[PDB]
Amino acid sequence: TVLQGQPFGGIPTVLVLNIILWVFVVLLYSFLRKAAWDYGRLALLIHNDSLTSLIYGEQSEKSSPSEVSLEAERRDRGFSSWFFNSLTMRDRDLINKCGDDARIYITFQYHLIIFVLILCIPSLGIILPVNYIGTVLDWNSHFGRTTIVNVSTESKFLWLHSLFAFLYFLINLAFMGHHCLGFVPKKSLHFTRTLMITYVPTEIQDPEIISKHFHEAYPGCVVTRVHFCYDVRNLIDLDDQRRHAMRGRLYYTAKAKKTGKVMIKTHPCSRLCFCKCWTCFKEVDAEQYYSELEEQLTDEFNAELNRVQLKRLDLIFVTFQDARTVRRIYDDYKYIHCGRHPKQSSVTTIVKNYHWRVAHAPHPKDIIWKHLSIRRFSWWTRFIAINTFLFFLFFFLTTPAIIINTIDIYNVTRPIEKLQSPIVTQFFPSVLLWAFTVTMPLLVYLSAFLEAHWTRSSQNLIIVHKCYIFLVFMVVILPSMGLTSLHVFLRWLFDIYYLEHATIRFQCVFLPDNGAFFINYVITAALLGTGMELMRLGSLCTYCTRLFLSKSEPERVHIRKNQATDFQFGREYAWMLNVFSVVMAYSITCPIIVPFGLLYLCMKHITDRYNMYYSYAPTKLNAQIHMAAVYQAIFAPLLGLFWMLFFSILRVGSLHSITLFSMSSLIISVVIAFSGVFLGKLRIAQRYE
């Protein structure tokens, strides 16, 4: 009696397909670097060529560089010189490239690679052999009796599975503790002499009033400076437009001085028509039009700056001489909502010190003057709305990855006629889900930019949190909660009716009747996605951006100024934590996803090390991102414990004593995760001053 269950799974077919994809993409890179010239290195050289003083250039001492950049970017030239004779690294190859941020990257990366290695010893040599010996399924089936389906209900081995899950959450906590023991994070919150104050009445146009209030409230306190904020979004836009016009004017002036006047067409649709008729599009001088537009933009910028003084916001900045009085101000002002009246002065009635909420002012570079205007308590209701919209869109978008698995026949009594083709049944949903996961962070970034929150530190934290949470949701739970579909509803009434069916039917998990979908996804995602990451996936973004506004030839030089894209650590941690979460979720269940998880980790390291040294422009990382990424890493096995609880309740029962360890660990695991989190904040507090 055979109706479903794919023998040997889709693993071999997707394996040959992804190795073909990998060799194809590596050949495509090589041919792009050999035929499209220095596409991926000239932009990097231009970006680091003193961008602070790139528009204007002066001949200084030793103008010709001493091959500092040439020495590094001259090793990988041959086609075969990409893998061997290239690392010689032994934990010291690239420490002095990006700073301490790159140092913590692989610090955690390895605390992962060796972590998944120490997982590959018992999860391949203990749980896999004892799950293979299960015989509740059919012997003839392969990859169906190697997963958690094969362990029988009436057996003392699901206890081993759950206990192993608990001890593996413990060992992951130990690994992350070893990682945290060597964080020694840089003190990002330097003792700032300037504070940020909100809700300040706009009628106090004199900073002397605020200075007098601070002096009277705090004896012995000196106010260095007082700063006020203004609506400068239009000012910023006008400045950007003027900068673009000025750069284009210089480019066209140089072109005119070199090869004479150049005639261009201002209309964007001129390039669309190949018509050479004079009446179709009027031709105007490039430099004259550029100068006129720049003059008009400068006049509008001057008018906006003149009107800026009238648009005073309620956010102010006060600078003090000593940070001790700043700490006193913060300690007095943090608990205002608790009913304590802070220190007052003679002009406090105008000041209204009971309204002010003062915290440590972020760095001005971290401060974006355009998006500090995003502050209201009409918040947290748009957030639920945008979150619901994104969740519904992602559900309706990932539904095809589930419905492509079709539905069994159950109509005629002769299933010998034909069966499903493994290619589109297994590889296609996997690659399609991979494409959706790859395109997800773009939409997540767009949503976060729409929200814009309060400060960019919180913005990056909410990115690295919400992108990860949506990804693990869409990749673990609802792809399986909706994969409980194809439910057997026929002569066999409930799940365990032996009426006209063998033990192949298992309502607990019958996703492709074995669970091969997720391992198929992880292997294809590994190989294809890191083939894309070798080509960096940012090339498609650049292509789309140029196709959006392909015009105004000096804009090509403008693009080349910022053609080199820096590291987007949010996306890379999103990928790593997504696959880590899915592996930890199905590690104990199906142990075949473990060695392929090792393959993903090792090959991801292989690609991003080369990216680090030759395609990832160095740039510092905020410590909060890593301090949250470790928290996601430790919280990931709660997904696996939740899946173990799910399998206890469905397959085993409710009051069965095992359902309770999964029931208990999930409780002990969450309480221990909270303990570890608040211990991490406590250690930060210790290593804060």
Author numbering: 26 to 714
Article, verbatim:
The TMEM63 family proteins (A, B, and C), calcium-permeable channels in animals that are preferentially activated by hypo-osmolality, have been implicated in various physiological functions. TMEM63s, together with its plant orthologues OSCAs, are members of a newly identified OSCA/TMEM63 cation channel family that are activated by mechanical forces of osmolality. TMEM63 has three members, TMEM63A, B and C in most animals including mouse and human. TMEM63C is essential for maintaining the kidney filtration barrier integrity in zebrafish, and expresses low in chronic kidney disease patients.
Using single-particle cryo-EM, we determined the structure of TMEM63C at 3.56 Å resolution as a monomer. TMEM63C contains 11 transmembrane helices (TMs), TM0-TM10. The N-terminus is oriented towards the extracellular space, while the C-terminus faces the cytosol. Between TM2 and TM3, there is a long cytosolic domain mainly formed by α-helices. Similar to OSCA, the ion-passing pore of TMEM63C is surrounded by TM3-7. The results show that TMEM63C is in closed state with two restriction sites, the radii of which is smaller than 1 Å. Three bulky pore-facing residues (F542, F543 and Y546 on TM6), highly conserved among TMEM63 and OSCA, have been proposed to play critical roles in channel activities. Particularly, the short α-helix located at the cytoplasmic side of TM6 (TM6b) swung to TM4 to avoid the clash with TM0, the intracellular half of which moved close to TM6, compared to that in OSCA. Additionally, we identified two non-protein densities within our cryo-EM map of TMEM63C, which are likely composed of lipids, and may contribute to the modulation of mechanosensitive ion channels gating.
